[PDB]
Amino acid sequence: VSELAGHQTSAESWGTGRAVARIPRVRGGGTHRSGQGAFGNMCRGGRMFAPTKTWRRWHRRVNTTQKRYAICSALAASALPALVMSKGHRIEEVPELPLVVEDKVEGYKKTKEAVLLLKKLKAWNDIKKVYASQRMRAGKGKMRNRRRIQRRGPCIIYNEDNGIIKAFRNIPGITLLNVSKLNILKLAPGGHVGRFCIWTESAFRKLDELYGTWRKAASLKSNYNLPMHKMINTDLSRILKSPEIQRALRAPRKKIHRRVLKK
Amino acid sequence: APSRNGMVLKPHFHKDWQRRVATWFNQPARKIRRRKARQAKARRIAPRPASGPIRPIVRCPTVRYHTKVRAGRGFSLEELRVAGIHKKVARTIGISVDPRRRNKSTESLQANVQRLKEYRSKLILFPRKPSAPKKGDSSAEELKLATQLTGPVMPVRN
Amino acid sequence: MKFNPFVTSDRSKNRKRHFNAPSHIRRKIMSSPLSKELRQKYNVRSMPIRKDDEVQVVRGHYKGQQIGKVVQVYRKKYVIYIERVQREKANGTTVHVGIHPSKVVITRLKLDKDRKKILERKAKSRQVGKEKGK
């Protein structure tokens, strides 16, 4: 709020012999404002309690290793099929969910051939879901320039732009990403992992040099290697029905012993 | 009042600080502004090397940092003399004289003269009248090797 | 998506400029689409309305095929009055009902030197755009 809001008044606190509360009252005598309470957070026309400042520490810094961690996690979750489905992305006729294409599509120029490519690649049901998801916001965002809201669609992760952004950029929901500069705010839109992604062959080959395998480090990040697992086999059912654990267990107690009635 | 156990602190907040609070919301805007100023300056001096003159090698002046070396303000008049060039044509060429630096060591003197001679061998000099090359260079190098150098002219390493 | 940083997308700014726009800008606002035969004879999709051109209504209560001549362009109220687009108030007299130029369609142009010139400019610009996007 403005730093002068509620304070350009010259009000005085009117003593205590008069039978009114000791709030500062507007000094004067010719208008409605005269003798009304001022300066207070409870007064009409005063200043708010603890007026908000601009030096509010709006920004937050995150460790680079954790941002890279979040990127790798969102990429893995994009690879997993149940998690992309669970974001609700309508992937049922897509073959081979890590979806990689040629570089003629990086050389594309028109929205017609981009839409045709998505129809041939069976992402058009996700685009149609975005179209069906378009509607108005609820509340003050409409007055504050956010009228229309809609779902998120797939990402296209390219290596070179030879017109691919402009070939896209008009289909709603489609986010272009440029694999070298990867954004967690667009790979995990709500803080939830699992967004549908379509890769180019050049970007999909560059990934293994951008983040490295485990046998070698990354060649474009200098000091970065992938984080290690705390659990190499995350299959509880397999580990518990494995015969070694079963041999080491004891017998289960499946007889429920309810309370007896004391005769 | 002190609660139980803690530091004795002395916050310097007794002096009406929140009129002279300075915020940094214009930091990305001024980074953009400096970037485009550098771009404009480079394409203004398009063949000249985009960052300034060559700087000398300079020993940092304290027992904490006197093992390291860094770029200095400018070359001195003695080592310009041993390099054999005049202290005005040096600044027209791009050498950054600094007259107030002395030399108390022939080793640093010879290092900077060798650096200066290396730059002078590396320098491509355009003629004044392009139809009339008086003493500048040959049109062969003038055509093929007229490229702008980005970053500092030959950098200072330890 | 808009990309030009000097043109705004602020709803309040756009509404304010639309509502207190001056009169020639108001004319440019109150442009209207041409019929298909007119577009074919020319090559122009829309046109700023004029005092004495025939027109027909495609939306609202007075929708129909009656080719009425425009009789008034009330740019102050962003509306037009046509010949037979009328209603009879309580007195028995008749008043013109004003409707929107984006809700009419022009069927015959009041043609003169300036309107031939601006139809030529619009058609020429669409032709240069087509030959560029050949």
Add this chain to the structure above:
RNA sequence: CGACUCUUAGCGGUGGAUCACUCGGCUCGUGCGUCGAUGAAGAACGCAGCUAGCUGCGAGAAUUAAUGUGAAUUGCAGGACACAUUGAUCAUCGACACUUCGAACGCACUUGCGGCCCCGGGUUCCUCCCGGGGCUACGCCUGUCUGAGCGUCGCU
């Protein structure tokens, strides 16, 4: 059975909460970064066919010219406007114009009182009156003219 009082419900008042809206703010960012004796900021008083405020303007007064634009403005009226023997409106604005105060400038703040030089009328050069026009503030700089000094000197 009334009346009166109390409660609840329907309807109707009083009142303007709530919700929805927003040509307004606030905050951040960007580019420019320009007032005045050639009269500024501010003030006053006027100006529209009907007009008090707000807005615009200055006795050319809700504006002239010019240039773009191209048929309206509009609450009512009016008569214009061939759109080529030249154009309504709006925008731009580079031409012209710009009352009285105000640093405010003849003196003074009363619409008080002057002075000098020209022009026209009464004259029928001779200046008396009337009207008009141009000057008439302070400080300061360079140059000019007119001077002052038992200031320092030269020729008698």
Add this chain to the structure above:
RNA sequence: GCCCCGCGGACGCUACGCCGCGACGAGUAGGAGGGCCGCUGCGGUGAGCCUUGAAGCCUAGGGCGCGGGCCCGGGUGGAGCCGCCGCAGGUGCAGAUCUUGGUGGUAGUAGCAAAUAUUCAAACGAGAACUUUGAAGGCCGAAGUGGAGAAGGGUUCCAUG
């Protein structure tokens, strides 16, 4: 003799879930936990809802929840709104001789009591205790309730409606 005339055999285990057993339950100041309690906005998600009627408001209607609260029906209204996962607050009122706005009882009450005084008739007019005209009775009683000015006011002056 590796089952079988048969080919078959309830529910469960959001593991942050489900089930069992035992003991216990006061509470200011204060502390802590949970909240599928509530408010406003943001990122996501509901191929969510809505002019075949959204928000808001009213309700002798039907219910749920220990509760905070919530859902449904009916009416009114006439354009937007909510559920879930996260995020962020100018986020929950009975008090402050609180602030602003509104409305009561008091109450058709106190009051409309300083300076002697009015009355009859007519006119105009829809309408007369109060206007105008006439008649009467009175008062100010020239240090005036008279006739003119200065300050101050600014059109109050005068006709008509």
Add this chain to the structure above:
RNA sequence: CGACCUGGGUAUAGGGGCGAAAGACUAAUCGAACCAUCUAGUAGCUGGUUCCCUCCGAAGUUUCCCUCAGGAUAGCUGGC
């Protein structure tokens, strides 16, 4: 008929004026005017301090303090 009353014009301005002196008067304000700002001045003092369940649950005592309507400290409490 007088140290008389009174209009207008002038002069004196806030720790200042002016006072036949009462701390009177100085624009309904005077034992220090009014107006704005410093300023949301400070307050160990008064008042208020807004949703629900669940669990635990006090102290008014020790020592020091220009301390006795306050704090620090130790106890008593809760949480991890």
Add this chain to the structure above:
RNA sequence: CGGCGACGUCGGCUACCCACCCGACCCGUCUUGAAACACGGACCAAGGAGUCUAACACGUGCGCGAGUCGGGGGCUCGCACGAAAGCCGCCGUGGCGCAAUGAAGGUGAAGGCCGGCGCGCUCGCCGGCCGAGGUGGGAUCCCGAGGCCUCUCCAGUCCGCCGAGGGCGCACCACCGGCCCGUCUCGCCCGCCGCGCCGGGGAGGUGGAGCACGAGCGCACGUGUUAGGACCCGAAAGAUG
């Protein structure tokens, strides 16, 4: 097992009104004590009070780890989002941590065993290995005498369970030794380019926020203190014009 069920009755404790019995003083507040002859409150709507920044502290979560952190700067199409994001590494400067102690000149954290020899003098000479000492507790783990069986016996084949005792002992606690710096007391050696008013060392006590095979750094959240208007409202005053 019985009875009764459409234009009259059945159910609806929850909801409206009323009746009766029992119980029941008006809330908020300060207070040892409030229904108080204590103060505030006629009524209703809306607004209305622990916030934000900085700095510490501890707890918790996350990443990396003897390191950690780009926060300032720079490099990347033309800047919807994007004022975001990504990257730098001869951008790690720097901060904090990795070493303490002393007022300061300054100094500055490993022992035991085995052999020989002086004088194996409370101790040097060399050599050899081992590697932060010892005691008492100590979660966990290891060995384990002996047991427990099968239609049944004779000679062993396999693993399973209980197990007295024993062993290595995490973290941590208690103690005892040791090592570093300051400072005392006592005493004798050694070194040299400078033989000095030089330098170094030993034993025994004491002062230290020390060491004794690191735990920190960054980010986030909570709670508590503090300085800021600082939970909200409130002086009598003081100052400048």
Add this chain to the structure above:
RNA sequence: CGCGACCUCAGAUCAGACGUGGCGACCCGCUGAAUUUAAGCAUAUUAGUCAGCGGAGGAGAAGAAACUAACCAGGAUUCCCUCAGUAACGGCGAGUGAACAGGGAAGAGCCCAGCGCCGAAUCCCCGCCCCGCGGCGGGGCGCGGGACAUGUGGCGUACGGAAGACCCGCUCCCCGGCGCCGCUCGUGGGGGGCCCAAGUCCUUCUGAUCGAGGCCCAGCCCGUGGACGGUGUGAGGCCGGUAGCGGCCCCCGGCGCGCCGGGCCCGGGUCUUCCCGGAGUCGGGUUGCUUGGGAAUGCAGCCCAAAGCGGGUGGUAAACUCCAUCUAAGGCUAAAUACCGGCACGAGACCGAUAGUCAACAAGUACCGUAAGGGAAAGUUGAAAAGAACUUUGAAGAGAGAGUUCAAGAGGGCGUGAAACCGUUAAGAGGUAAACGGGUGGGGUCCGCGCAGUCCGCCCGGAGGAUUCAACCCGGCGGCGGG
């Protein structure tokens, strides 16, 4: 007993110019409190801050060492990170508190006086005509005036400089327009104007539709345009716009060479001979303010008052002696940095009419005060005025009909229309003021479309129909297994 010359002054409505005042967000020079904190309070703190006064600019100030340092040294100013809440100051209490080095942003250096040489080489003003005008100069001419030796210009400034020889190199500058470039870089360089894709297709909803279905071939159409706003609701395709090294037309700019127009003329190394600096200032004493600056950090007043192998600094006062470092007392200077004023824009996890600016509106307005100054309240008919003709009662306000509209249960302070409070209707009740908690009972309003009351798995019997059940054969696909 004059006439000149100079000096020092004066006057002028003399010829031509210049200053004043405003704004003040940032900047510079002064002046400069007290609230507050110290749990009192006086030094300290607040604070060199508010208030006050002066002066500017698009920035300003500062700035090319009388510097840092003590190193193997760095090298103008400004700003950022760090140094660092540290050295230090401080009733050593509360509190206060920098610098250097290092890493970056930016980067640029220069000019006098003096000392000296050159016949004052210099500068201003006025006429003549020539070449120009459009922020007004070029040169020529004048036996034209003045400034100026009480010192103008050229060389030249601490990094040294000047003059003679000797050698070497002949090497090439600035300003004004013509013409067309470069077509003038983020692609136009800037300003202005005018334009540029695709549904109002078919059927339906509605008061109106921008709603809802459909539109052969993968399909309504465009998409480098699916931002936004308007339009009787929610619109990529109705309109304006949006995207695009998209188009066209005017005006202005920095720009390369062929000229012409004018000036402008020698640089570097070797030796020799010379020349070299800012005074009531530094510094000292004292006093006051200031600083972290502590036996003086800075500034100022008064007194004393320099030197020339000197002077200053070398964070403890002083003497002696080494060394380091700079050269004061003259001047200019971009960039990086600041910006709550202004002009013009863009955005927002912000507020939504008691909020947000005091001000969404005829708001610094109405109104108050002698004045300084104080200072509000106040948004919403409807899609469109279609804003209710006409009849009738009343003097009228006000009604009753009629009419518009989707709606007047929208009628010019008119969206929604809460609560307090009131009127009326209905129902119930009423001498311990009302109201309340438990427990029943009675009445009433609504609900159960309450009112013959289940459902469904197995098999038994009856009467119907109809494929076909099992089993094989063929084809396909899954699951499991394969040395």
